[model samples]
Target chain A: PLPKPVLDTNGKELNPDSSYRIISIGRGALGGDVYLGKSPNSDAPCPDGVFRYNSDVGPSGTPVRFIPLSTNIFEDQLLNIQFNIPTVKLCVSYTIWKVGNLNAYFRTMLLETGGTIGQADNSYFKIVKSSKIGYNLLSCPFTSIICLRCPEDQFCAKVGVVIQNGKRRLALVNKNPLDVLFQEV
Target chain B: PLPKPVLDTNGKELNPDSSYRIISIGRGALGGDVYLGKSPNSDAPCPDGVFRYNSDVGPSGTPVRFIPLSTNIFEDQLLNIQFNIPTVKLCVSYTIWKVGNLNAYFRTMLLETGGTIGQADNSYFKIVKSSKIGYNLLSCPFTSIICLRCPEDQFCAKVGVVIQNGKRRLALVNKNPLDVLFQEV
Candidate 1:
């Protein structure tokens, strides 16, 4: 390290109680977000505005992997694995929109997809989408230790996003990692 | 647009308060503080580790254009003009880090530059950068009507950032039109 205190771009010394001082800004501490297209396996580097989740690509029946955004597959993250970190706080800023008449709820959930993660109970948030072309935001903070079994085992799960409305087209724009910007002091 | 009430990506109707919400896990809004950088005539797109304020880039011998980051001359802004809007709320999220020591105060200010914008008080906030390589965040809220001589002039000043520590090497990264993201409702 260059010293105990580093000077900002303007030459001024930094502070001490800098708890919220974020170190990196981007997805999984890497580039940005991962944009997937409607093809059976068409994931992209960046967004092209005209892409959608191929609602039937994941597992048996259902849209399969077609309409879900999973955070566990970013980049250097845990591969095909499940389970949440014991101490992790995610700041989710969702920019949502869609083509529909009836209102519905977009859900951010913790699912046991790819592998043997665990049980899942109250691991979902019904983000209200009150507008046809606007957005909504949510902050999800959680902590779990032990109880790798039983009901609450839901704590040890993976994070994913799903819009619970059939037929109506919906799209969500957000960054990866979805964690806090500041590096812990 | 469609109806004032909109449907989010999930089809749910929106709440009346669907404004430009920045749902970060932290920040210069309802979470932490915001950080800004000050260097001379060196207004580039991003930060390059070693940054400096070209204190003599503006008009007279004053720090002139060296202290503020205004939307005045950005690509497609109002061009050349210098002044702030009356209705605007800024939610700033800063990512920072470092290699040394000695902390200082970071300030975000709204000033009366070039034009006869008038008095430059209350338009200042001294954000504390208490860490060497981390960052700070702040929310600068202000409004102005037509009272230039009796206080309301606060809305008409330009925005600038200055880390008042004289000569150390600091760098700040932000975007163009660095202005607030949403138009007030």
Candidate 2:
């Protein structure tokens, strides 16, 4: 199976305007989420056992991939993709390496849930979060990648890969550990 | 499943600045590295489907729980929590309605393949042009929701829904499309 998705935010609290900012992220192999730990947060922030995805593509092409050779179990090995170069395209893909074929791959199909802005009441409005088609895996801009081990407690947990095509990885996200979690108000 | 995560310019792509200048986004349904699509990106000149995560409190006092939902798949779900409301100690949460269980959800995780400065020489260096994360339904700022049924298909695919939290309405994710012999990409 793949990792879970949740809303996220910055700081320890959620701002009304910035509260509804929903994003996905991960931590180690668990690949959970991070968000404001409510009001007066406990020194021990809410349980954050997931890894947030970072999209910080440098000048060089860095193909990032999630290769966890296990499920809710354990992993076999780990590897990394360098985005310090350039190539042509910046594509990402995912495949489930199961007990049968290492070549059989499932090309992920992307869709959209067009955004909306609503007016609940004159004083109260709403911002329904975006709906997602779960169970997705991102790969590098290249094809046919092999992995050894992935961080986390689960093995073969729907791997993740990142590949920067061109000589400059121009589409990487920020390195803020709080990448994909909402900040509730 | 959620829609694919798109890349946002925010400020000319992200680097290893380590500050808070970068703003990239991804979602759950879409696992691994948040992509920036290669070709046929209708999401261009628009706001990329990316946001930030806080892990604890969501936009409201939405209780936030980051658990490893599926085994092979990992995605985070918002949960319901205890709130103080006044003292701001009201620990909000994103109530669980997926499987009706405590730890049944999803969380997408992105692992680093290669992180080298001069990674240009790295054999896994492949520059990615852009990326995209697909989803059936989505709307940032979870408050007000919108569902559209058009005449393009002339009700070919009707609006369907699955109940959760003891309420019924337009389903979030299309889940399964009945007709899938041949259609648009």
Candidate 3:
């Protein structure tokens, strides 16, 4: 008979501490969360980038967690997520709970346009329809606004897919940078 | 011909506070400490939940400043990123910087296998090598790894992609759960 091999982690962190921001792609009890968040400021020194919990409010009322984003899926994880619009770029950090794969859901968006080359593409236009948006998946990998740099008159957009329970969830956004105002009090 | 209309926001946050993690797809100028990482233990009490700084090497080529695992990226951003093999499941929280569309060069992955139903899914061996023989694009998104589950001898793996210049760039990996460690004390 063949001999068995021994195993040891040497007291190392095998799995990351998934307590906050996460990008997952699964569903229910068969899902997992891909927690990937952190902070970026010196004075603040933030962690926990972005977190989204993808759970289905069951008909009879049952809670199910999603899988970590592409971490458990992705055919070689070569998924190309494109933004549907340009908006102010936000940053976030997060963690995940339990242990498994994940997939988040979101809405689609549009960036208004009409400017020239240096107009700053940052304004967005929302679609007054689909109420079933944002509720598409279970959770998102993390949270971070993608501020675009297109001409104000020009149009720019982006999009992403969250992976949970081995599914492809998406987010529809209208986060154009020029779409907001900066003021001082 | 006519004057435009006036627009305003309900409210605004100046230098808001936030928290989250960070992951760089491409180093733009790779060398030492190639990836821009985020921290794991920061709470979301900052404005942007992140950190940013100039990417100029210091005296001996060391980064001007590098926090342990804080998620921060303000100065420059990379494209095409997903998860780092060793730490792909970290949670993060962040605030809304402004708003805009985001893009990354990453795609989805799919693994097919049947085990004890749920317990054997995100376990590693569930993801078999495709293209006939896996281990192809292994060095972009993250370093893959494997685990041998007790009494089962199952094979499970994790893959990731990179975000460089705002694109999803993936890399295959095949590590053992008891092998490498990606952090310092």
Candidate 4:
């Protein structure tokens, strides 16, 4: 039997081809809408392009489209995501940087194109039911058909915020995953 | 009169429509070819996609094409660069992150697309002559037609390396820019 289908705020099943805004369900800094905006730290020497939250932008967050690996939409299935912006597909950077002294890999989410799709690539993501409410976005690195090894403590975790040089970037983390709802555009 | 045309290793003027490999002319760690390769740090939690150097991979770096803002190609003129790899174009990240504590902006170079063209956008770059040998790649942020304001000491600098989470990424620095010669592909 198929798992439960992913649904939007309207309680309708999410169509893989349609557009939606991934809205956060939390309050304060964790809550808001996600958009492809320039990092706010205008002077830190780091790479460009990241997905940030506006907390007050409401439903006006940038629209994003999804491409599921399979025909039917079900929770926990592999899916490909892209921003409604031209040529800006969501991808995880292959390199890791220090958030303090801790080693991080496959955590930084970026916007780009030509990303690899399928269960093996890092570009693939999953939407799972949150313990409390709504759904949580997740990504697991090194999920190749050969060896699904994700170093120590680097399991498939929820997506959350990691403040680097003052810019709050979307990242994969172990706790406080931003609970999100899908709003059809 | 137009500024002297940017020349390739063969002394031929660069054509906007043609492709070329930007090869470094230094030795040891600072010398090598540049390519759109995955960051070596497979476990750092940061955003993905950056250009790196391979000191041993001679003459085999990825091919990149140029899109000059003007019809004629000349040194010191604005040019938009793209890796011959599909839709991967070079752009500076819009946010700033610390290399330690020194606020840096417009330093991180990334591979993506849909970047704005012309002098106003961060995607534009310049090929200037190096003091010693070949031409040096440079970028100046905030060179808009209205206000060409760059925060203090943030003048046009050359492209070099900045180690973050073990990945040597291509970045704009105040000194020791990668001296490079163009080889038409």
Docking class of 2: incorrect
* Tens digit per residue, CA lDDT, model 3, B20-66: 12222223333122222332222323221112222314211111111
Q: Against the true two-chain complex, what DockQ does each candidate achieve? A: 0.01, 0.01, 0.02, 0.01
For every candidate, the chain B TM-score is 0.18, 0.17, 0.20, 0.71
Top candidate (TM-score)? 4
Q: After superposition, which runs of candidate 1 have C-alpha atoms over 4 Å from their true positions? A: A1-56, A59-128, A133-135, A138-185, B1-59, B62-77, B80-158, B167-185
Q: In candidate 1 chain B, what residue range of length 10 has the lowest lDDT sum?
A: B93-102
Candidate 3's residue-wise lDDT over A6-74, tens digit each?
111132211211111122233564333322222231132332222223442232111112122323211
Better of 2 and 3 by lDDT: 3
Estimate the lDDT of model 2: 0.19
lDDT, candidates in the order shown = 0.21, 0.19, 0.21, 0.57
* Per-model TM against the reference: 0.18, 0.16, 0.17, 0.41
Candidate 1 residue-wise lDDT at A144? 21
List model 4 lDDT by residue over A16-73, tens digit each. 7788888878766656776655544333333333455656434466677777767867
The lDDT ranking, best first, is 4, 1, 3, 2
The runs of at least 3 residues in candidate 3 whose Cα sits more than 4 Å from the true structure, single-residue gaps closed, are: A1-185, B1-105, B109-163, B166-183
Highest lDDT among the candidates is held by which one?
A: 4
Residues B6-123, model 1: lDDT tens digits? 2232334322233212111222321211122343433433221222223322221111110122311121111121112121232111112121111112311222221222222222
Q: Provide the TM-score of chain A alone for each candidate, in the order shown.
A: 0.18, 0.17, 0.20, 0.71
Candidate 2 Cα deviation (angstroms), residue B177: 7.1
User: For residues A18-133, what per-residue lDDT tens digits would candidate 1 score against the true structure?
Assistant: 22121222223131221212222223222211122233233211111111124321221111211111211321111111111111123122122212122121112222112332
